[PDB]
Design a protein around this nucleic acid. Sequence first.
RNA 1: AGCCAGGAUGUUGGCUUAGAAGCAGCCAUCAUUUAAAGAAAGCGUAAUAGCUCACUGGUCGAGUCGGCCUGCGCGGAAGAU
Lengths: 136, 141, 94, 131, 38, 106
Amino acid sequence: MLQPKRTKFRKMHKGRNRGLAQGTDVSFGSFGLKAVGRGRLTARQIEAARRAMTRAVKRQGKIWIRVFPDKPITEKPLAVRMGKGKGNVEYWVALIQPGKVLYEMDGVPEELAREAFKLAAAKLPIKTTFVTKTVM
Amino acid sequence: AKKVQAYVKLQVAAGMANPSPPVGPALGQQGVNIMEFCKAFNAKTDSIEKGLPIPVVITVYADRSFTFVTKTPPAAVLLKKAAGIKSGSGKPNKDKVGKISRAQLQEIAQTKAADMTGADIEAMTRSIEGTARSMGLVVED
Amino acid sequence: MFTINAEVRKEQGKGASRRLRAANKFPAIIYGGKEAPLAIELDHDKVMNMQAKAEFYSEVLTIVVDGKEIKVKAQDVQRHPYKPKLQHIDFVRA
Amino acid sequence: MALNLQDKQAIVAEVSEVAKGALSAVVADSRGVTVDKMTELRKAGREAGVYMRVVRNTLLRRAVEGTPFECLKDAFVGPTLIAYSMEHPGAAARLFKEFAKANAKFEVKAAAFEGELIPASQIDRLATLPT
Amino acid sequence: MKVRASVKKLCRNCKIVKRDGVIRVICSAEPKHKQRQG
Amino acid sequence: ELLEPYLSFKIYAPQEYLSRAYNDAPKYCANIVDTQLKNNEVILSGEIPARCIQEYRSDLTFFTNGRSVCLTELKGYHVTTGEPVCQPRRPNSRIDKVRYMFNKIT
RNA sequence: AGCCAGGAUGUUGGCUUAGAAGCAGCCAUCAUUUAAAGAAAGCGUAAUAGCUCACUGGUCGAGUCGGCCUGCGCGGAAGAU
């Protein structure tokens, strides 16, 4: 579970998710995992998918994670009335507009990487697709 | 030339009369007696050096005993006394465990040619010398 | 075989470029040198196969337009955010 | 299967073995054995080297493609499985009779040893060889 | 028999079939690989 | 250092079922041992621990098809096996000065 | 796409010597005989043996396999006068 180390403010705003993400190209590894869909990813989903593919590459190569949570998500406790205040923080989503790279991979064969990214695309609510590094 | 029936190529050093902790049941898995692999196993061993693991055909037949034709010991155990070190692979390309040369390994190659199938001696040279590359050994050409 | 037929653009802007993008063609422009920049419309189906080669981003292109040939390089390119398609390319003159 | 650059090469190389070649014999192991592979091919080591090519690819458009350029009668051998065996040392070598003796030595069949073209003859056993 | 909505092939002997408009995965080899739904 | 006896247990099984007796080997705690066939009858020299040896008899009554037969006797104090190193209480009581050994614990 | 074939001798290879041996995990991932064979994708063993595909011949004899881009649909989809 990834999480920011101290922040300017605890609770913050819901906010809208409009737009498309900057993280387009693969910039480190040989292969990426571009998000086709749209939506927040909790810090657990990043870690769950993170271990679902680190297994398939068998601790070989290197796997960068291009997204980082940095967004607190409050929650009103069960059986509580409206009002009284913004609720306590629970988990740290990272909003994912379409086109965002999520994981990048290097040091492994391609079709194996297809397997490792596939079994980790399973853990992500958003629909993703496999991509590849380009000569600009 | 009958095909597969029950023959296998597995036994340890030839000097170990009547093995049991190594092979044990495997040679006794058929109807052949355990006594067959020491009183007759040593009948050809005495002709040459003892202690060298030499595979041999064990074509078992219903008529008590079995025919057999001795072959050639593997090159892996051959790379010990003739290579000095008793070790082998484990750490191949990561470091040089040892080395010999082509002038000597090719000289032993034709002694094994009676069992090897090659159109020419040079063709059987690197196929044996290439087995020592799996050991991490680097032949000196 | 680095050659691409290309009609000249007539309607610049985001409006006409959406209508054109859906027609399996995308906008592009050639610029550089003392000459003034000239926008160059071209087909999408052909260029999409060309980028696969490492040479397409390095070796000079020979785009034909109005009969006259203009050697160019792919100094810049704009990927589509998730659909496998090109949107616009900056063909700097060589 | 590999494209034309590799298929034609396998034929042109066989043609080079015909210009200097001579005697050859059919063989058709519909149920061959690798132990039999260590008989007629080990014999090549007894003779000289690897230059002999059993080339079991008697396709009517492949091996027979080189037929019009060398020995037109061989195209009649094209039907069914056939394996030519060109010779270079010793014209009318004793290799021809071996294909028949091996057929009685656990080989099931060997295309009835019909032979090729030195007297332009047919399925005729011949002990009359330069020995 | 299994009734999973996903019916990716298990062993190499499986073959997709659409009986009565219903996707199925028949298997001449192992009966356990047989499954409904799809 | 806990240890358990592992006496050898030879057994006779029909050769046709003898291949089914090797499957019982992976379930049995015993390690493989030398054996020799005897015409249609077959036998092999096993060696398994006595804690599980009492269940070995159930294995030859099923896989043998009624032809199973075996015999063994306790031997070899060496053994040692997991897990946890459980021990059977208790020792000892009804002896002089036994309550003073409790002071030695602390 | 089917069809009788073939799909090797040392590799009981060194390894922690109780065994891993084409297939637990380590590495190398040889090269030969050759129409062809990875010193190995799966099955099967305490380990082997064994059974297939990779690949390659013949029979056969005309087109076919595998991805993308999307259109329209199928399944997933069970509630109580």
